[PDB]
Design a protein around this ligand. Structure first.
Ligand SMILES: CCCCCCCC/C=C\CCCCCCCC(=O)OC[C@H](O)CO
Ligand SMILES: CCCCCCCC/C=C\CCCCCCCC(=O)OC[C@H](O)CO
Length: 426
């Protein structure tokens, strides 16, 4: 096929190898925390002390699986703070040095993250592994940047859809494999996928930013440092607005508006998506195995919609499809929030899947069309960073309201707040 097919193919297979490696360990995390608690790990005990303080503050009942999910949520949140910190820098660096050298630095970091975990099963090794993997998770935003390097709006909108399929397939099949593996072998499979991704990208990712299109600098002074690290400067896209041939006027307002909608969407969606672990236990007494089955079906529907519908939306129709998805999430979360049987829960999950499939891909696709050739890493790095900030705060704030106000209070209120990104877009 053309050179555009070849790059997206390499980006997709690389990213799927990456996401299998990460998601593989997620169904095992409950057992690994429980092991540390049971060995009296005094560092574990520190963090358990923090989760406890939080559990007391929000009024969360004392129960093994409620603790497991809350601890997994603090851990998930700390990790997203690392992704937020590093995504703009990694982007700006690649704008200046090319996509391939920075993609490869990031993958050596991810491979090293799994080398560490492989060697030691302590809470310390766990956090050391998460820290390194966290600061090296720019490979994700570099994938979106590489798609944004492509020539046509069509190339880009389909590229972002294909990345959507990677995340949906990765988050589906990874935990499936992990729970099928003997625990000893799991960190070895993560390593195999992470080393495979590194080697695959080394041999097959073509460069999509030529030397004569690159940003002259990463950051010259403290104001440029702050442009990559301040949540408000990342919302205002100040790093992009201060680059070579940047967007200005109406074009720069639009970029900011898509970013605010992106952040708000993911703040709300990531919160309800996390607290669905509370709702399916508390209301329907789902085992974590049954939560496995449910997220599996969600991921498969999402990959189908992403591959089949999201990927076929005519360039120019991204925004119309996002507005329709944000409206669909109002009934979707009302049905989940209030449903007292599996048919009603099921209907809300189906709408959840159709709507979530479209939003991240369609918005990335429109955002990717902004910035000059040497700013694609800074634009998509800034977008990923806003998502990371959103997935950092979303779970914690939804957990507070879920336990302080109850499932209905949280799911009704978050449902209402979806009209904020809907109206910001219209
Ligand atoms: C390149 C990446 C490699 C760097 C790893 C560095 C130091 C760890 C050296 C190994 C020390 C192991 C600590 C003992 C431990 O983890 O406890 C017992 C273990 O869990 C039973 O499987
Ligand atoms: C380019 C970089 C190359 C790679 C550089 C590697 C750096 C990794 C450093 C520290 C993490 C290792 C932590 C090892 C944990 C030691 C064991 C421990 O903490 O105690 C065991 C626990 O009490 C019960 O098993």
């Amino acid at each position: 096929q053309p050179p555009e097919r070849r790059v997206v193919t390499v980006v997709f297979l690389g990213l799927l190898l990456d996401l299998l490696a990460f998601t593989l360990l997620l169904p095992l995390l409950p057992g690994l925390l429980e092991s540390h608690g049971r060995a009296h790990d005094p560092l574990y005990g520190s963090w358990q002390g923090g989760v406890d303080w939080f559990a007391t503050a929000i009024g969360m009942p004392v129960e093994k699986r409620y603790n497991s999910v809350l601890f997994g949520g603090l851990i998930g949140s700390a990790f997203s703070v690392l992704q937020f910190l590093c995504a703009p820098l990694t982007g700006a660096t690649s704008d200046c040095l090319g996509r391939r050298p920075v993609m490869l630095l990031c993958l050596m970091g991810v491979a090293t993250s799994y080398a560490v975990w492989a060697t030691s099963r302590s809470f310390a090794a766990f956090l050391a592994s998460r820290l390194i993997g966290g600061i090296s998770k720019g490979n994700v935003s570099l994938s979106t940047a590489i798609v944004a390097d492509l020539g046509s709006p069509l190339a880009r909108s389909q590229g972002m859809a294909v990345i959507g399929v990677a995340f949906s397939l990765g988050f589906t099949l990874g935990p499936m494999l992990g729970a099928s593996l003997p625990l000893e072998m799991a960190p070895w499979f993560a390593l195999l996928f992470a080393a495979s991704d590194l080697l695959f990208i080394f041999c097959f990712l073509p460069e999509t930013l030529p030397l004569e299109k690159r940003a002259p600098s990463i950051a010259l002074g403290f104001r440029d440092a702050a442009d990559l690290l301040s949540p408000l400067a990342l919302l205002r896209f100040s790093a992009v607005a201060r680059g070579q041939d940047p967007p200005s006027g109406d074009r720069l307002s639009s970029l900011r508006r898509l970013g605010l909608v992106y952040f708000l969407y993911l703040f709300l969606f990531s919160g309800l998506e996390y607290t669905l672990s509370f709702l399916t236990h508390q209301r329907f007494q789902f085992s974590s195995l049954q939560q496995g089955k449910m997220f599996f079906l969600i991921g498969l529907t999402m990959a189908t919609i992403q591959g089949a519908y999201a990927r076929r939306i005519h360039p120019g129709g991204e925004v119309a499809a996002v507005k329709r998805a944000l409206l669909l999430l109002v009934p979707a979360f009302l049905l989940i929030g209030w449903g007292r049987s599996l048919p009603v829960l099921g209907l809300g999950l189906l709408l959840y899947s159709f709507a979530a499939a479209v939003v991240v891909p369609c918005l990335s696709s429109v955002v990717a069309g902004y910035g000059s050739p040497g700013q694609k890493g800074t634009v998509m790095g800034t977008l990923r960073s806003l998502g990371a900030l959103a997935r950092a705060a979303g779970p914690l704030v939804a957990a507070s309201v879920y336990w302080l106000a109850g499932a209905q209070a949280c799911f009704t209120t978050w449902s209402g707040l979806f009209l904020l990104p809907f109206f910001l877009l219209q």
